[PDB]
Amino acid sequence: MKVIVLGSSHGGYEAVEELLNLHPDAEIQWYEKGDFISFLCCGMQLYLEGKVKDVNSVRYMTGEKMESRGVNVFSNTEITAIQPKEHQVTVKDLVSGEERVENYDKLIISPGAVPFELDIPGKDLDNIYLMRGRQWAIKLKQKTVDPEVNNVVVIGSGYIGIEAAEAFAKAGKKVTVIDILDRPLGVYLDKEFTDVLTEEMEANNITIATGETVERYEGDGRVQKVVTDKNAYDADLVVVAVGVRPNTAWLKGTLELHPNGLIKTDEYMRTSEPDVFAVGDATLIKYNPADTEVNIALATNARKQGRFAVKNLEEPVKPFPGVQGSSGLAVFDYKFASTGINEVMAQKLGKETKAVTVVEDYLMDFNPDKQKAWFKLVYDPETTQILGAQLMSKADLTANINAISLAIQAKMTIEDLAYADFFFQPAFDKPWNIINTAALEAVKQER
Ligand SMILES: Cc1cc2nc3c(=O)[nH]c(=O)nc-3n(C[C@H](O)[C@H](O)[C@H](O)COP(=O)(O)OP(=O)(O)OC[C@H]3O[C@@H](n4cnc5c(N)ncnc54)[C@H](O)[C@@H]3O)c2cc1C
C-alpha cells in the first residue's frame, strides 16, 4: 500500500506516526514544500523571549530521523494538484523546477492555513510582518533587538497577537494592540478574566485599542503610522495577527469545500473523494460541548485527527470522539486555561448557558503561599450538564482544566463535580478544591 502524506506539521506528522505503527509494511512518502521539516510554531514565543536560543531546535522531527524509519521524505517539494479518480498527485520539486506525477493508494493531506493579511492602502510598506513559520520567527527576533524599533503595533488581540505583544513588551518596546473586538482574548476567556489581563498588560506598557477598524498603513518606504477609523498610531513595526485562511484554493474544483474554504470531511476524516483524507486547520472538528462541527485551529486537534485518518484508512471503523476546545497560556504573571463554551462561543452557536464565578485564595487562610484564583463554571440551564470552565491564577492550576474537559465529554452535572473525589493536602489546595467549590456554588444557585 503506498500512502502519500502532505504536510510535515502537526496533522501530517501524526498520520506518519500512526502509519508507522499500524501499517509498518507500507511505502510512505511525506511531502513538505518548505525547507524545514516539522518546525513548531507553538514554540515561537519561547524563542522570541530568549528562553530558547536556537530557532532550529524548535521542532519535533527531522527528515533524517524519519528516513531512518523507512519514510521517504521530500522537502522543498510541493503537491501542486490532486487527480482523485486516477489516484495521482502532481508534484513539483522547487529547487530543480522538475514536475512529476506520483500514484498513491491512499492520500492524507494536512495543508493547514496561511496568515490572513489586511488588503488596505500601504499593504506592504516594509516592516509589516506576519507570525507563522521559521522565517517569520527569525525576522521577528531580529526586530526585538533593533534600536530603531520603538513602537510596535500588533493588529489582532487573540492568542497569537497577545503572544507577540508580550514578546515585544518584554524586549523593551512600546506596544499597541488594535482590534475591532471589544476585549482581548474574548474567544478564550470571559470579561471578568479579560478585565484582569487588560490591567496586567497595561502595567507592562501595552496599550489595548479595541473597537477600531484599521484603514491604512502610512509611511515612506517602510511603515510609520497605522491609521484606524478612530485614531492614528506611530509604528516602527506592525505584526498582523488577525487570523488565518485555509490553504485550499488549489483544491477548488477537486474536493468539496465549505463556503469559507474549509475542506468538507466526515467523522472518519474522509473528503468528498475516495481514498483522500484531510486533517488539521483546513477542516472542521466535532465539538462535544455543542454537538456540532466547528473549526478549532489547535495543534492538539490536528494530531488526533491525523491518527484517526490512518485508523480509517481501509474502513470507516473508528468515528472521531470529538474535542472540547481546550487551550491554555501564560500572559505575564497569569496562567489561564479554558475549555468548552464561554460567552463568545455561546453567542456564535446560539446556546443558552448559566455560570458561577468564584474568586478566592486557593490555599487555606493560614498558609502563607495562598494566592487568588478565578474559576468560572458554565453549565446547561436545563440539565445542569457541564459546558465549559475557565480558570486563572498567578499560581499554575491549569492542569485542573483537564478534568473539566473529561467532565464535558462524560456529560457530568454540577452535582457530580460538587462531590467528586479530588485529593486534599494543605500545601496544594483546600478541602473542597477549586472545581468542587465552584460546583458547590452552582448547586446552591439551582436549589
Ligand atoms: C504562533 C502560533 C502559536 C500557536 N500556539 C499553539 C499552541 O500553543 N497550542 C496549540 O494547540 N496550537 C497552537 N497553534 C496552532 C497550531 O500550530 C496549528 O493548529 C497546527 O500547526 C495545524 O497543523 P496543520 O498540519 O493543520 O497545518 P500547518 O501547521 O498550517 O502546516 C501545513 C504544512 O503543510 C505544508 N504544505 C501546505 N500545502 C502544501 C503543499 N501543497 N505541498 C506540500 N506541502 C504543503 C506547509 O508548508 C506546512 O508546513 C499556534 C499557531 C501559531 C501560528
Q: Pairing state of beta strands 354-361 and 372-379?
A: antiparallel
Q: Annotation-wise, does 111 bind a ligand?
A: yes
- Sign of the torsion formed by the C-alpha atoms of 411, 414, 416 and 418: positive
Q: How far apart are CA 177 and CA 209, in angstroms?
A: 6
- Catalytic residue status for 10: yes
Three-state helix/strand/coil letters over 25-67? CCEEEEEECCCCCCECHHHHHHHHCCCCCCHHHCECCCHHHHH
Q: For cell 474568586, name the residue.
A: 359
Instruction: State if residue 12 touches ligand 1 by the CB under 6 angstroms criterion.
Output: yes
What Cα–Cα distance (Å) separates residue 120 from each residue in 123, 129, 296?
5, 15, 27
Coil, strand or helix: which one is 132?
Answer: coil
Note whether 31 and 110 are within 8 A (CB). no
Q: How far apart are CA 79 and CA 89, in angstroms?
A: 7
What CATH homologous superfamily does 41-58+113-244 map to?
FAD/NAD(P)-binding domain (3.50.50.60)
Residues 6+ apart with CB under 8 A from 51: none
Element (H, E) at 164: helix 159-170
Closest CA to 122 of 211, 233, 227: 227
Instruction: State if residue 33 touches ligand 1 by the CB under 6 angstroms criterion.
Output: yes
Q: For cell 470529538, name the residue.
A: 322
Bridge partner list, 331: 334
Coil, strand or helix: which one is 412?
Answer: coil
What Cα–Cα distance (Å) separates residue 270 from each residue in 5, 267, 288, 314?
14, 7, 20, 11
Note whether 361 and 372 are within 8 A (CB). yes
Q: How far apart are CA 305 and CA 298, in angstroms?
A: 11
Q: How far apart are CA 422 and CA 319, in angstroms?
A: 31
Cell of 101: 506525477
List the domain boundaries for the chain: 1-33+60-112+246-326, 41-58+113-244, 334-446
Three-state helix/strand/coil letters over 381-404? CCCCEEEEEEEEECCCCHHHHHHH
Note whether 408 and 398 are within 8 A (CB). no
Q: Which contacts of 121-126 are long-range, i.e. CB under 8 A and separated by 24 or more positions?
A: 121/215, 121/216, 121/217, 122/216, 122/217, 122/218, 122/219, 122/223, 123/217, 125/217, 125/218, 125/219, 125/221, 125/222, 125/223, 125/224, 126/221, 126/222, 126/223
Q: Annotation-wise, does 338 bind a ligand?
A: no
327-331 β-sheet, strand order: 327-331, 334-340, 386-393, 372-379, 354-361
Cell of 353: 448557558
Query: 206: buried, middle or exposed (CB in 10 Å: 19+, 13-18, 0-12)?
Result: buried
Cell of 390: 475557565
- Catalytic residue status for 41: no
115 Cα–ligand 1 center, Å: 11
Instruction: State if residue 194 touches ligand 1 by the CB under 6 angstroms criterion.
Output: no
Q: How far apart are CA 329 and CA 166, in angstroms?
A: 12
- Give the resolution in Å: 2.0
Q: Compute the C-alpha angle 64/248/281, nearest 5°.
A: 65
What Cα–Cα distance (Å) separates residue 52 from each residue in 36, 49, 330?
18, 8, 16
Note whether 258 and 293 are within 8 A (CB). no
Q: Pairing state of beta strands 106-109 and 214-218?
A: unpaired
Q: For cell 455561546, name the residue.
A: 346
CATH 3.50.50.60 matches 1-33+60-112+246-326: yes
- Please report the atom of ligand 1 found closest to the CA of residue 163: 1
Cell of 290: 455543542
Q: How far apart are CA 378 and CA 357, in angstroms?
A: 9
281 Cα–ligand 1 center, Å: 7
- Confirm whether 1-33+60-112+246-326 and 41-58+113-244 share one CATH topology: yes
Given this structure, which CATH class describes domain 334-446? Answer: alpha beta
Bridge partner list, 375: 358, 391
